[PDB]
C-alpha cells in the first residue's frame, strides 16, 4: 500500500472543517436555540455532543487513518461480513449530491442577481409580484423577498407540482453548470488540489462571519435579537423532543459515519495524531454554528425592532432563512449591495466543500474499490458530475424546489442513521473495542481513554437510536407549504432511502452465501478482519 | 504493585538457543504493550522487541529481527522472548519493560535476567581462603580475604559468616580471562575479633550448586 | 535508527553543584517522545523524566528536563548523595527505540590513601599447583591509581589482574584488589613478593611485603 498524502497537515484540518462547517450551521442550529429554550438548549447539545458525537467523529477518523482505504475498503476490510455499510454510505453520498448543489446554485444565482444598485427583491413592484405583496413578512400576506424567490428565482408557483416540473430555467441551468465545473476542476486531480482549493472555500466562511457578525451585532435592535436567540429558558430541556433535537442536530451537522472523513484520513500519515484533530475540528464546528447564530439573529433582531416585522415570522430556518429572511434585512440597510454579495458568496463557500466531501467520498471510495478508475480519476469524474448535472436538471426546472425538497426529505437521513448504527455495531462489537483501541494506539502513540471506549461502546448506538427513534415518531407524510406531496412521492422516497439501507443486508447475505463451510464456519469467516 | 518478574537466562552455546519468560502480575496485562529491552556488559542499554497490547504489531531491532521472536500470554500474564541462532554479543542482561503509551516511557522494569553466550565450559569456583602474613595479626584491625577462583559463569553469591556482616566487606566484580572468572573479597574486622572467634567466608555458585564454607587460620 | 549521543560520559560532582548532562539526538525526537532513566548501581532502570520535561512518579522534585528537536538536557539543581547513577535518554518516536549512551553521575570526595593489604597464597593454592599472591586496596579516592608487583626487584607487567570496585554509596570511596597469578615453580623460583601502590595522596608509594619462607 503506497498512496499519495494530503501534502500539509493544514490542508487536512481545512478540509475537515470545510466539510462539517455546512449550511445547517447557519440556518439550523440558531434556529433550535431560539425554538428550544435559547441558551439552555446547549446543554443538551454539548451533552449530546460529547457522548455520542465526538466520539463517533473521532471513530471514523480514526478508522479511516489507519485502514487507508476508502469507505468500501474499510468497511469491507475490518468486517467483510458488513462490507454493505461502505456502498451504503457511497449511495447515500451520490443520492445527496444530486439535491444538495442545487442549494449552491441558488446561492449563485442570487450572487448573481446582486450586482444592481437597487436588490431587485427589495420592491412589491415588480413583475413577479402579486397584489399579495408585502414589504417583510406578514400573516397571510408573502414578502418582497419571499415573492421575488418563488416567482422569479424559483418560479415555483407556475408548477402545480411535484409531477409538474415544467421548463428548465436556463439561468439556473447554467448557476448549476457553473457549481459543477468548480467540483470538477477542484476535485479532478485529487487531494494535490482540493486541499489548496479548501483553503478558500472553508476560510472564506469565517472571513465574511466576521464582518457579518460586525454589522448584525452594530444594528439598532441587535440585543433584542440576541435575547430571543440565548435568553434561558431551562424549562424546555425537560422535554424529550429537546434532547432529540440537540442530538439530530449533532450528528448531522458533525456527519459522523457520511464516509467522508474515511475518505480524508486516509490520506494521513499513518502516525498522525487524529485525536487532536478530531477534538479541534469537533469544536471549530460547534463554534460556529454558534458564532454563526449570532450573525443571523442580530438580523432577525433588527428586523424585529426596526423594520416593524413580528420576531415569530422571520425566525425560521433552511432556504427561507437565508433566501428570503436575511436577503430581506440585507436590502434595507447602506450598502446593500456589498452585504448582499459578502453574504451569498459566504453560502456559496458554506456548501462548496460539504459538497467536495461528498463527491471525494464516492471518488475515493470507487478508485480504491476499483484500480481501473484509479488510473482515469479526471475522465471518472467527468463522467460523475457529467451524470449529476443531467439529473439535476430536474432541479433546475420551474417545480424543481419539489425535487429538491422530496430528495432532501428522503435522500439521506433515514438510512445515514441505519448506516452509522451498523457502523458502531461493527466497530465496537464485533471488531472490537479493544482491537480498536490497539490499532489507534499503535498509530497515535496512546490508546483511546476509558470515556472513549465506553461512548463508542455503549453510547453511540443507543445515541442513534435515540436519534432514529424520535425521527420516525415525528414522521409526517411530507408537505411543503400547503403542497401535500402525493402519495407516490413518499413512496419513491422511502424506495430511495430503503435502496440506501438495502445494501447492508443484501451485501451481508451474498458474503454469507458465497463462503463455504457450515454457519459457525462462514460467521467467522466473515467477521475476522482482512489483516488479523 | 505492578511487579515483573523475567525468568529463564543462563549459559548457552553460540548457535543457541533459548526462550526468556517474564512473569506479569498486579495490572491488567491485556492492556498493556510490553517491551523487551537488554544491557550489554557495557551498561549500553539496547531495545530488542516491542508488542503491542494484544499481539497484533510486533516491532523488532535490527540487530535481533529474523532471530527472536517476542510473545505473549495474555490467559497467564506471561512475556516471553524466544531467541534463535544466539551469538556472542548477544549475551547481555534482558529486562522486561511495560511500555504502553509511547508519550510515558518504560514505566514498570523487571529486574533482568542474564543471558551467557559462550562456548566455555561449567566449572565449579576452587575457593580458597587467604590469611594475613605471619605478623602480628594486631593491629588494631586485620584483613581476611577469600579467592573464588575458576569458576564459570557468572554469578556467584559471596557473604560472610552467612551475611551476619556486610560492613566493612568488599566484593569485587569478576573478571574474565583464560575464559574462566577470577573474583575476590576482603574484609576488615577488628583482631578483637579473630582469631579469638570464628570468621568465614560463604561461596555458592547457582550453575555448579556449589555452596562452601571456608574459615581462615592465621597459618 | 536515531543514534543519541549523550556527553559527558562521566561526571563527577560534589554534593551542592548544579548540573547538565545533554542528550543530542542524530534526527528530530518529538518534544514529547524524549524520556530519561536512572538506572541505580545494580538495579533496573527506572523511568525518571518523560515528555523531556516531566518528573516520573516518586523523582525528587530537583530533577529538570528541557529542550527540544535534536537537544535536550537533564539538569540537577541542588545534588545530594542520591543521585549517584547512570542516566540514560530514550527517543520513543520511531523504531527502534534507541537509548542513548548514558551519563554516569559520580560523587566527588576528599582524598584517602589505600588501605594497602597483602596475603601470601593460602595452602590449598600451594598444593594445587598454582599460586596466586592477593593484593587489596580496600578504600581510596579518586580511582587513579596503579599497582606495581615487584618481585626480588624485577617489575611484572604479565601475569597480574585487576578489579575495581563500583563507587561505594556509604563514603563514595573506591576499592580495588590486584592478584598476580604463578605457578608454584615461579613461586618458588623467587624470594620476595611485594606490592606498590602509588595514588594520587602520595608521591611515594605505600608498600606491604613477605618473604616466601615467613
Ligand atoms: C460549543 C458549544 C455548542 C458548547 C458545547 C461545548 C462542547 C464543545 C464541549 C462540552 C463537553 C466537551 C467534551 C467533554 C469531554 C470530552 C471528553 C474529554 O475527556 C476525555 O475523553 C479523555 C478520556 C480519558 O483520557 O480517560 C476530551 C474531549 C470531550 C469530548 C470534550 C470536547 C468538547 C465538549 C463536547
Ligand atoms: C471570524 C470569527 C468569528 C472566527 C474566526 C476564527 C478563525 C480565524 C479560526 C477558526 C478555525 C481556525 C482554523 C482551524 C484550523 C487550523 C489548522 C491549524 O493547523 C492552523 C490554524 C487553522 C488554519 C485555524 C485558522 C484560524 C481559524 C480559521
Ligand atoms: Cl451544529
Ligand atoms: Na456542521
Ligand atoms: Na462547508
Known amino acids: 500500500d503506497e498512496r499519495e498524502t494530503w501534502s500539509g497537515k493544514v490542508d487536512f484540518l481545512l478540509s475537515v472543517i470545510g466539510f462539517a462547517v455546512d449550511l445547517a450551521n447557519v440556518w439550523r442550529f440558531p434556529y433550535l436555540c431560539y425554538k428550544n429554550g435559547g441558551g439552555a438548549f446547549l446543554v443538551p447539545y454539548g451533552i449530546m455532543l460529547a457522548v455520542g458525537g465526538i466520539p463517533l467523529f473521532y471513530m471514523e477518523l480514526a478508522l479511516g487513518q489507519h485502514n487507508r482505504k476508502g469507505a468500501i475498503t474499510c468497511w469491507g476490510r475490518l468486517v467483510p461480513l458488513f462490507k454493505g455499510?461502505?456502498?451504503?454510505?457511497?449511495?447515500?453520498a451520490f443520492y445527496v449530491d444530486f439535491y444538495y448543489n442545487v442549494i449552491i446554485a441558488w446561492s449563485l444565482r442570487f450572487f448573481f442577481a446582486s450586482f444592481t444598485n437597487s436588490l431587485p427583491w427589495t420592491s412589491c413592484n415588480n413583475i413577479w409580484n402579486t397584489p399579495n405583496c408585502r414589504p417583510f413578512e406578514s400573516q397571510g400576506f408573502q414578502s418582497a423577498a419571499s415573492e421575488y424567490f418563488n416567482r422569479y428565482i424559483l418560479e415555483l408557483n407556475r408548477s402545480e407540482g411535484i409531477h409538474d416540473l415544467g421548463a428548465i430555467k436556463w439561468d439556473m441551468a447554467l448557476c448549476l453548470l457553473i457549481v459543477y465545473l468548480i467540483c470538477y476542476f477542484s476535485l479532478w486531480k485529487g487531494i494535490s488540489t482540493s486541499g489548496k482549493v479548501v483553503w478558500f472555500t472553508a476560510l472564506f466562511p469565517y472571513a465574511a462571519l466576521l464582518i457579518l457578525l460586525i454589522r448584525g451585532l452594530t444594528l439598532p435592535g441587535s440585543f433584542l435579537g440576541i435575547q430571543y436567540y440565548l435568553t434561558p429558558n431551562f424549562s424546555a430541556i425537560y422535554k424529550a423532543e429537546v434532547w432529540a433535537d440537540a442530538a439530530t442536530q449533532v450528528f448531522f451537522s458533525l456527519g459522523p459515519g457520511f464516509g467522508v472523513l474515511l475518505a480524508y484520513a486516509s490520506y494521513n500519515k499513518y502516525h498522525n495524531n487524529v485525536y487532536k484533530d478530531a477534538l479541534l475540528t469537533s469544536f471549530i464546528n460547534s463554534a460556529t454554528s454558534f458564532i454563526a447564530g449570532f450573525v443571523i439573529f442580530s438580523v432577525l433582531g433588527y428586523m424585529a425592532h426596526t423594520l416593524g416585522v413580528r420576531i415569530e415570522d422571520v425566525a425560521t430556518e433552511g432556504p427561507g432563512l437565508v433566501f428570503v429572511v436575511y436577503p430581506a434585512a440585507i436590502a434595507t440597510m447602506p450598502?446593500?449591495?456589498?452585504?448582499?454579495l459578502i453574504f451569498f458568496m459566504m453560502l456559496a463557500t458554506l456548501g462548496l466543500d460539504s459538497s467536495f466531501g461528498g463527491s471525494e467520498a464516492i471518488i475515493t471510495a470507487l478508485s480504491d474499490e476499483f484500480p481501473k478508475i484509479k488510473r482515469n480519476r479526471e475522465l471518472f469524474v467527468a463522467g460523475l458530475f457529467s451524470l449529476y448535472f443531467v439529473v439535476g436538471l430536474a432541479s433546475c426546472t420551474q417545480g424543481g424546489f419539489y425535487f429538491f425538497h422530496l430528495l432532501d426529505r428522503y435522500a439521506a437521513g433515514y438510512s445515514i442513521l441505519v448506516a452509522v448504527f451498523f457502523e458502531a455495531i461493527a466497530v465496537s462489537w464485533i471488531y472490537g473495542t479493544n482491537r480498536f483501541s490497539e490499532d489507534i494506539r499503535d498509530m497515535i502513540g496512546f490508546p483511546p481513554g476509558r470515556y472513549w471506549q465506553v461512548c463508542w461502546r455503549f453510547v453511540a448506538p443507543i445515541f442513534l437510536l435515540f436519534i432514529t427513534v424520535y425521527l420516525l415518531i415525528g414522521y409526517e407524510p411530507l408537505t411543503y407549504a400547503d403542497y401535500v406531496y402525493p402519495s407516490w412521492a413518499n413512496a419513491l422516497g422511502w424506495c430511495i432511502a430503503g435502496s440506501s439501507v438495502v445494501m447492508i443486508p443484501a451485501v451481508a447475505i451474498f458474503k454469507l452465501l458465497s463462503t463455504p463451510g457450515s454457519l459457525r464456519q462462514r460467521f467467522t469467516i466473515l467477521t475476522t478482519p482482512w489483516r488479523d | 504493585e505492578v511487579q515483573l518478574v523475567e525468568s529463564g537466562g543462563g549459559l548457552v552455546k553460540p548457535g543457541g538457543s533459548l526462550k526468556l519468560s517474564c512473569a506479569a502480575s498486579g495490572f491488567t496485562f491485556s492492556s498493556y504493550a510490553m517491551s523487551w529491552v537488554r544491557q550489554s556488559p557495557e551498561k549500553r542499554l539496547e531495545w530488542v522487541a516491542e508488542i503491542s497490547s494484544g499481539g497484533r504489531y510486533i516491532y523488532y531491532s535490527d540487530t535481533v529481527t529474523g532471530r527472536f521472536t517476542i510473545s505473549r500470554d495474555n490467559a497467564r500474564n506471561i512475556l516471553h522472548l524466544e531467541m534463535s541462532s544466539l551469538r556472542s554479543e548477544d549475551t547481555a542482561m534482558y529486562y522486561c519493560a511495560r511500555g504502553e503509551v509511547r508519550q510515558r516511557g518504560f514505566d514498570y522494569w523487571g529486574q533482568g535476567t542474564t543471558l551467557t553466550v559462550s562456548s566455555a565450559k561449567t566449572t565449579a569456583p576452587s575457593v580458597y581462603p587467604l590469611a594475613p602474613v605471619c605478623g602480628?595479626?594486631?593491629?588494631?584491625?586485620?584483613?581476611?580475604?577469600?579467592?573464588?577462583?575458576?569458576?564459570?559463569?557468572?554469578?556467584?553469591?559471596?557473604?560472610?559468616?552467612?551475611?551476619?556482616?556486610?560492613?566493612?566487606?568488599?566484593?569485587?566484580?569478576?573478571?574474565?580471562?583464560?575464559?574462566?572468572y577470577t573474583l575476590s573479597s576482603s574484609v576488615t574486622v577488628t583482631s578483637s575479633t579473630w582469631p579469638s572467634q570464628s570468621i568465614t567466608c560463604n561461596v555458592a555458585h547457582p550453575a555448579s550448586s556449589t555452596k562452601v564454607d571456608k574459615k581462615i587460620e592465621p597459618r | 535508527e536515531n543514534v543519541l549521543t549523550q556527553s559527558p560520559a562521566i561526571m563527577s560532582t560534589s554534593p551542592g553543584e548544579k548540573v547538565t548532562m545533554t542528550c543530542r539526538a542524530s534526527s528530530s525526537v518529538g518534544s514529547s517522545y524524549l524520556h530519561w532513566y536512572q538506572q541505580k548501581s545494580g538495579a533496573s532502570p527506572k523511568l525518571w523524566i518523560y515528555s523531556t520535561s516531566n518528573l516520573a512518579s516518586g523523582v525528587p522534585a530537583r530533577f529538570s528536563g528541557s529542550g527540544s528537536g535534536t537537544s535536550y538536557s537533564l539538569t540537577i539543581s541542588s545534588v545530594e548523595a542520591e543521585d549517584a547513577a547512570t542516566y540514560y535518554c530514550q527517543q520513543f518516536s520511531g523504531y527502534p527505540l534507541t537509548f542513548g549512551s548514558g551519563t554516569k553521575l559520580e560523587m566527588k570526595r576528599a582524598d584517602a590513601a589505600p588501605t594497602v593489604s597483602i596475603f601470601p597464597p593460602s595452602s590449598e593454592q600451594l598444593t594445587s599447583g598454582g599460586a596466586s599472591v592477593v593484593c587489596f586496596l580496600n578504600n581510596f579516592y579518586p580511582k587513579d591509581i596503579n599497582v606495581k608487583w615487584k618481585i626480588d626487584g624485577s617489575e611484572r607487567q604479565n601475569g597480574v589482574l585487576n578489579s575495581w570496585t563500583?563507587?561505594?554509596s556509604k563514603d563514595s570511596?573506591?576499592?580495588?584488589?590486584?592478584?598476580?597469578?604463578?605457578?608454584?615453580?615461579?613461586?618458588?623460583?623467587?624470594?620476595?613478593?611485594?606490592?606498590?601502590?602509588?595514588?594520587?595522596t602520595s608521591t611515594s608509594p605505600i608498600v606491604k611485603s613477605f618473604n616466601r619462607n615467613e
Open chain 2, 136 to 180: 602480628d595479626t594486631t593491629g588494631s584491625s586485620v584483613t581476611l580475604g577469600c579467592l573464588v577462583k575458576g569458576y564459570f559463569p557468572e554469578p556467584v553469591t559471596l557473604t560472610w559468616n552467612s551475611g551476619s556482616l556486610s560492613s566493612g566487606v568488599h566484593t569485587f566484580p569478576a573478571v574474565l580471562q583464560s575464559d574462566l
Open chain 3, 173 to 200: 570511596t573506591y576499592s580495588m584488589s590486584s592478584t598476580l597469578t604463578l605457578t608454584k615453580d615461579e613461586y618458588e623460583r623467587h624470594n620476595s613478593y611485594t606490592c606498590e601502590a602509588t595514588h594520587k
Open chain 3, 166 to 168: 563500583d563507587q561505594d
Open chain 1, 85 to 92: 455499510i461502505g456502498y451504503a454510505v457511497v449511495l447515500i
Open chain 1, 335 to 340: 450598502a446593500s449591495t456589498f452585504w448582499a
